[PDB]
């Protein structure tokens, strides 16, 4: 509880479809982007945390809640764009006479700040008297001991909770989701999604000299001008699809009804025909 682990993963493919065929996870409340539509979404920095709590305390893992474990043991900020996964672990985390291998903090002066782990254990002296490493009436121990017995109903049984801190900051992603690796595109317009970056335009080859550390490529603005192939390392510029304006040449409805269209910005290829300047 107070020593929740953190095993961050990076540079790997995360297929969340495996979690469905596992043990029943009737706690999949994705406080974030989307519970189902998650495989078609890459991540940059995913932090996987884990801890074991009771049953009636799982509702405090949501971003923003009161209680005892959501204020002094493990508190989440009101910006968490991720998912929480919990399941009944009363089959292997609850033994005879109670499993005392889980300790939770009970006495803490101030509220726990976002993403803080209190691994220290000092004698909680609640003021008004100088205490020492002993136990008395006004001086007690901050950490407590959980009693996980199989004779408890829904609410007092152990529940292994594991969350995924999806940062998703603007940066070259490392943890992409599972998707069918399709082929390349010729001088046509597509909806490519190269390494998280989801743009649209003509993917034509270029003659730029990218550096070994460079992945993306921009221009005088924030537009992704060029990019390198993830599995080919080729410099291909990303030019947007052909667009323009439409001007209707009308000689007047009182005279006739024939019109003429002026596709300004086209070379008579992406549309008699007469190319003007």
């Amino acid at each position, epitope marked *: 509880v107070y020593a929740w682990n953190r095993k961050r993963i990076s540079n790997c493919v995360a297929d969340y479809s495996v979690l469905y065929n596992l043990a029943p996870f009737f706690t999949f409340k994705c406080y974030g982007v989307s519970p189902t539509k998650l495989n078609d979404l890459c991540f940059t920095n995913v932090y996987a945390d884990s801890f074991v709590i009771r049953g009636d305390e799982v509702r405090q893992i949501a971003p923003g809640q009161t209680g005892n474990i959501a204020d002094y043991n493990y508190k989440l900020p009101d910006d968490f764009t991720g998912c929480v996964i919990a399941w009944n672990s*009363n*089959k*292997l985390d*609850s*033994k*005879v*006479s109670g499993n005392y*291998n889980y300790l939770y903090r009970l006495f803490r002066k101030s509220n726990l700040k976002p993403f803080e782990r209190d691994i220290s254990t000092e004698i909680y002296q609640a003021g008004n008297k100088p205490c020492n490493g002993v136990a008395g009436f006004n001086c007690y121990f901050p950490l407590r001991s959980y009693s996980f*017995r*199989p*004779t*408890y*109903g*829904v609410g007092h049984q152990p529940y292994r909770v594991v969350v995924l801190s999806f940062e998703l900051l603007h940066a070259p992603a490392t943890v992409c989701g599972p998707k069918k690796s399709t082929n390349l595109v010729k001088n046509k317009c597509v909806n490519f999604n190269f390494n998280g970056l989801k743009g649209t335009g003509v993917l034509t080859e270029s003659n730029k000299k990218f550096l070994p550390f460079q992945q993306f490529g921009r221009d005088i603005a924030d537009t992704t001008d060029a990019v390198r192939d993830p599995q080919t390392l080729e410099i291909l510029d990303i030019t947007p699809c052909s667009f323009g304006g439409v001007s209707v040449i009308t000689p007047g409805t009182n005279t006739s009804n024939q019109v003429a269209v002026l596709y300004q910005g086209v070379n008579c290829t992406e549309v008699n025909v007469f190319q003007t300047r």
Partner: antibody
Amino acid sequence: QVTLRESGPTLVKPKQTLTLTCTFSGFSLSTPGGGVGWIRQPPGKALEWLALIYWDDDKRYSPSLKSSLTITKDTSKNQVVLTMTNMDPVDTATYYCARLTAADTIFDCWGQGTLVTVS
Amino acid sequence: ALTQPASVSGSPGLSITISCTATSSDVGAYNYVSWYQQHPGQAPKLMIYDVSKRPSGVSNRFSGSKSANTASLTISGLQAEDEADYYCSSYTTTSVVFGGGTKLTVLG
């Protein structure tokens, strides 16, 4: 598969310390949720649990008998040994050691039976 | 603990039920309950655990349920090779109870 065999002296003097063992083979005791226990079955009576060990050196015993039941694990040679003192001529029964795979599967695989008469 | 009927009789072909009562049931919700079968001279083998399901290797003759707090073992199609003792077992607050005994005597 799981083979739970017992051994030890069947006939013993009264008021002594039993050394009934349980040699398990076919699985590892270090699995999360595993453990080997002991169940007594008197002739013409019902079952009764005596002791149970786990994968974290925890030794759980019956609340009625705690001053004599002393179980120990020997995974180094895969032989669970049970020791009990103050043997009275009422404990004569066929003992069984079964593996507790998990909480839902309470002692799926059992032993074979060793009658330990106390007279 | 758990109390079970001492003597239960059953005609060959009919079906009989057992009673696994509360008897100061400190088990709580009584979620997990397993039934065993022990023939005279052999070791007790698991017949049905988690009465909502059945283990592999057991025919459909054995089935169980628990209405409110009492587990029942419904054994249909009695045969000569069925006279054995059955036990219901659960998890108590400080031990693992195995209940009482139930001897089946198939007459005829």
